[PDB]
From a paper:
A key component, the RNA-dependent RNA polymerase [([name]), also known as [name]], catalyzes the synthesis of viral RNA and thus plays a central role in the replication and transcription cycle of [name]-19 virus, possibly with the assistance of [name] and [name] as cofactors. Therefore, [name] is considered a primary target for nucleotide analog antiviral inhibitors such as remdesivir, which shows potential for the treatment of [name]-19 viral infections. The structure of the [name]-19 virus [name] contains a right-hand [name] domain (residues S367 to F920) and a nidovirus-specific N-terminal extension domain (residues D60 to R249) that adopts a nidovirus [name]-associated nucleotidyltransferase (NiRAN) architecture. The polymerase domain and NiRAN domain are connected by an interface domain (residues A250 to R365).
Author numbering:
A (entry chain B): 67 to 192
B (entry chain D): 84 to 122, 127 to 191
C (entry chain C): 1 to 68
D (entry chain A): 4 to 896, 911 to 932
Amino acid sequence: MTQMYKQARSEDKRAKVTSAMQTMLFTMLRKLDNDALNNIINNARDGCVPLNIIPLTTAAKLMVVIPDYNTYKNTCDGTTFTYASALWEIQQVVDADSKIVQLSEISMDNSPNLAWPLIVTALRAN
Amino acid sequence: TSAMQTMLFTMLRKLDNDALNNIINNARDGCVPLNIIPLKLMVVIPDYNTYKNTCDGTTFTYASALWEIQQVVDADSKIVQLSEISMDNSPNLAWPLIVTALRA
Amino acid sequence: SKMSDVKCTSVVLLSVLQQLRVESSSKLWAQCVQLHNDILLAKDTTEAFEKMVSLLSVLLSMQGAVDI
Amino acid sequence: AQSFLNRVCGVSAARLTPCGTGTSTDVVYRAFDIYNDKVAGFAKFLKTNCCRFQEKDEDDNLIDSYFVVKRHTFSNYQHEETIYNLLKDCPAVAKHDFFKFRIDGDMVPHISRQRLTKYTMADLVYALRHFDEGNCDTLKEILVTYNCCDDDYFNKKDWYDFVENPDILRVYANLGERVRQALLKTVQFCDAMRNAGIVGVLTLDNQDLNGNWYDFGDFIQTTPGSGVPVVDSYYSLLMPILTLTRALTAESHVDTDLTKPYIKWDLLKYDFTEERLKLFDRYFKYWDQTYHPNCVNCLDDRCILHCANFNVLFSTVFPPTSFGPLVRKIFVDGVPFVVSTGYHFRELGVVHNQDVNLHSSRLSFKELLVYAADPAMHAASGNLLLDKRTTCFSVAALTNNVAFQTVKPGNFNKDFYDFAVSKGFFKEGSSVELKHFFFAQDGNAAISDYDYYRYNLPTMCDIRQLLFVVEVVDKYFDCYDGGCINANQVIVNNLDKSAGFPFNKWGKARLYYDSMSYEDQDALFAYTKRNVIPTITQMNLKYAISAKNRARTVAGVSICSTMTNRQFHQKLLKSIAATRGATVVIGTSKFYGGWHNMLKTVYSDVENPHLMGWDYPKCDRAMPNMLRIMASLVLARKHTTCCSLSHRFYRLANECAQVLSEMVMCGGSLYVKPGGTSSGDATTAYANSVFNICQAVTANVNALLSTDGNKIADKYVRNLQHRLYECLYRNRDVDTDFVNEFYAYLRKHFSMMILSDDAVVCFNSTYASQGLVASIKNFKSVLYYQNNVFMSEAKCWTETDLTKGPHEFCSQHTMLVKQGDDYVYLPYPDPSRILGAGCFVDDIVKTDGTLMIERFVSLAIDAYPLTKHPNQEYADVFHLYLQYIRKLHDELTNTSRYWEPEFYEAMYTPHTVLQ
Ligand SMILES: [Zn+2]
Ligand SMILES: [Zn+2]
C-alpha cells in the first residue's frame, strides 16, 4: 500500500503542473477581482448567479465578429452602438489577417477588398 | 523545399496541356499574371519581343483563350494608348506594361 | 488517366502553395482551397483543366518562386 | 330529402351546402384512437356513419365548419342526451342537436353536432407521427386551411425536409396557437367533467381542431363532484407535437398573447420552479402522476425520465441566459474566486453541489484540478463576445483575437502512384479509381462546422411509449456486467489523447494520469458522486480522408471528465466489447471468421428473411437530449449494488453537464453546445448503440400499433397488439411478463446487428408486408417525429437474397466465397478507398520506412478478400499492394512473413485464430 498513497512519476512532474495551474488561476483572478462583480453578485437572492450573465453584465470589453457588410450595417454601424442594454464605443477594427481596418473603409464599394470575418473590439461606455 | 517544387514541375510537364504550357512559357518569358486568372485579367508584359508575340491589335492570347485589352498602363503609372507601340520608337515606352483585359 | 493525373497534380500544387505561406492571406487561401476542392470533386476532364490553369496562376503570379 | 336539411340547420347557419342526405360522405379514412375488447391501437380506419353538411359563409364561399349528423340507436341517444344536458354549459363542448326524423315508418333518432372542423386532433397527430411524403394530403390540407402556408409552398423542393428548407419549422410553428388553445379547452372540459360526476376516457379523435369536444357515448355518470377523466393516451400521444409546433411559444409574452412584448425576465434569476409548477398546473392539470421540477427529488430512473420530459417542454419558455453553471464567490486565503456551486439543466432543473467550501484554507491537487477545469473563472475573466457567424449561444472570448484554423492537403506518394500506373491502374474507363482524398479547409471551417448544432431542436417525447421502449432496451442489455471499479483496476490505452481545455496547455492525458495518485483519483470520483463538475471541450479540425469535401472535426473532453467516466463505465464497456453473439456487436474483430459468425448470428432463425439497413442523417448533431439521457440511464442501470439513488443521479448530472450541454472551446471562444454526442468520449460508441436499439424498438411498436387490428389474421399477434396498447397507455406499472414476451417476439421476427450508428436487420418479410414488424417507412416516420430529421429512402437499402449478405455494414461489403468445402462470408472494402489511402499519406511516414511498410501491410490485410471477387480489377488491387510491399521490404532489406500471400490468407480463416 504505497502506490495507492503516493504517485509514481512525481519527479517534479506533479509540481510542474500544479504550479502551472496555480499561476493560471492567480493570473485569471487578477484581471477579475473588481467591484462590478461585487455589485452583480451582492444583488442575488443567495449569492448564486448564472454564469452566462457574468460577462454580459460585468465585461468591460466586447468583441463582435461580423461576416459581411449587410451585417456590419445592421449591427455595428458608426463609432458607438448598443448591445446587451449597454452602450459600446468602437476601437481598433481588425480583419481576418490581423490587420487594422480603418472605419473609413467599410462601405459597399470597398467590401470585396476586405478579409471578411471582421473583429470589432469595443469598450463599455458609461 | 526544392524537391517538392521539382516534383510539381515534372508532373506539370507530364500533363502536357497546351493552356498550362502556354501560361508556363509566358511565365518563363516574363509575361506574368498579377491576379488569379479569371474563368478582369491583368498581366505584366516585360518588353516588346514578348508583346508582339502575344498581343495583336487589341486581342490578347493567354491561357490559350482570347481577351479584349481594356486598359494598358506603362510602368510610369500613366495610361498609354496601345496604338503607340513601335519597333523603332520603342525606347520611350515604359516597358513593363500592365495590360488589363476581359475574356471574350 | 488524364483525370487522376490532374487530381494528383492539384494535391501537389496546393502543397507547394501552402509551403509558400499563402494561408497567411485569408482571401487568397480561401480561393485556392475552393479551386483545389473543386478539382478533386470534378467529373469532367476539361473544367478540371480550366480550374488547374486558374490555380497555377496563383503560384506563378508571385514574381519569383523558382522558374529557373 | 331537403326536409332533412331544413331540420339539421335548425336555428343556426341557414346556409348549408347539401353535402349529404343519406349515409354519405363515408369514402374517407380517418385516424382513430380505439381501445376495446377486440381492437386496440391508434390507426386509420374507415369511418362510415356520418352525413356531413358544410356551411357556406356569406357571399357563397365555403367555410371550414360542418354539421355532422349521425344516426343512433335509442338507448345510446338517450344516454348521450343526458350526459350532454349535464356538460352543456361548458365552453369547450361543441353544440349538439338531438332530433327525430321519419325515414320510412319509424322516427329514427339523429344526433347532429355543429360547427366542427373537417379534421380532428387525432388526424393532425397521426399526420405528423406517421409522416410519408408520398401521401401527405391530410397534412397539406391542414397546413393550408389554417393559414400556415399557401398551396404553392408545396411545389418547393424538399419542403418537408428539416435539414434542407429549415423554414418548415416556421411553417409548423403556425399551428402552435391552435394546439395551445386545444390544450386549454381540454382542461376546461376535464374540469366540467369532474365538477359533474362524469367518468370517461378522453381520446384525440373526439376533439376537432378548433378545440371543442363531442361524442359522449362511453361516459358514465357518477356522484357529482367526483368525476374522473382519463387523459393518459390523449396527452402522451399529443406530446411529440407540442415541441414541433412550439405550442407554448405564447407563454413568453407579457400576458400570454402573441401581440404583446416579451417578458423581460430578471437576469439574475435561475430557479423558475414556481413558474414550471404553474405551467404544469395550467396545461396538464389532470395528468395524475407526480411532477418534480427539479429531478433531484425523483424516485427512480423512470421518474427521472418522466419529469425531464416535462422540463424539456417547459424550459423553452425561459431565457437561455439562465441555464448553465451557477457561480458563487468563495474565498481562498482571503483572495476571492468565482466557482460553480451548482447547475441549471434544461432537462433536470436546478442541481446544487453538496460539498461547497466557502472560506477555503488552501488548494490541494484535486481541488486545483476542479477549479482549473471549471469554466467559471475562464468565462468570468474573458471578454464579452457577439459572434454573428452562428446562431449558437456564445459565452465569452478568452483572448483579444479570434483564431482561424486551416487544414492542409495530403501528401502525395508519387512512388506508389508511379508503381500503380506502371502496373496498369487508373486507365481511362475503369471501375477502380481515385475518389477519396484529403480536402483542404479554409479559415471559416471550424465555426461553419460547429454551426451545424442548429439541427438540434428541443423535442418532447411520447413518455408512455418511451417508458416501455426503455424496458425493452434494458432487456437487450441484460447479459453484461457493470459497476464501479477502483482507480487501480482501470486499464487505459492511448495515454496520449487530448486532455481538453485548459489542460492541453501542459500535456497529454499521460501527465495527469502520472501526477494523480490512486487515492487522488478515487477522491475525485467520490467527489463527482456528490457534486457537478462542468467542463470545457476543445474542438479541433481533423486531418483524414473523405469522399466529401465537408470538414471533419474532433473533440477533446476534459481529463477530469474522462478520468471519472472510466471508473464509472469501464467494467460495462469491457463486458460489452468482450462478448460474442449478442445484438450490440462492438469490439468483435472481423478476422478469423468474425464476419461469418456475426452474419450467421443475425440470420439466426427468421422465417421469411429479408435484410435491411438504414442511416441517421446528422446523427451526432441531431440526437435528442431525452434519448441521450435515456441511453445514459440504461447504461447506469448496472450500478444497483454500489451506487444509491443520489450517487446515480449526480453521476447522470455530471455526464449531462460534461458531454451533453457542455461549453465548447471553438477557436479561442466559448460557445454553448445544445446537444448531441461528442466524438471525443469513450462512451458515445455505446450510447449510439442504445439510441439505435431505441429507435428500432420504437419503429416496431408504431408498426404494430398503427395496423388495423381487425384484419390481423393471427390470433396471437392480435393479443400481442392489444396487450401492447394496454402496457403502454394503461397499466402505469411495468409488466415484466409482457416485456419478456415482446422482447422474444422481436428477437424472433426482427433480428438486429448493432454498432454505433450502424445497423443490419434480418426480418420476416411476410410480417413486414402485413405491417406487424417495422418496414423502412416506419423508420422514416419515427425519425421524422422523434429526431427532427428526414431520412431519404435513397440511403436505406434492402436485400432479398441472403446468400449475398448486407449491402453495407461498417463501410464493408460482404461476399460469399468458398474456403475448403465451406462457403463463408468475407468482408471486402471499397477499392477506391483502398487505393486512395495508399496514394495519399500523412507525412508521418514519408520520413521512415518501417511505418510505411506497416501502413501498407495493414492496407493489404484489409484488401485481401478482393482476390475472391469476380471483377478482375478488384483482384488486381491486392496483387498491386503485394508487389509494392515486396518492393519496399526488398528496398530496405511461413504464415508470419508479411511479404507472401499466405500471411494474409490466414487472417480470414478460423482454423488459425492466432493474432
Ligand atoms: Zn420526478
Ligand atoms: Zn456504481
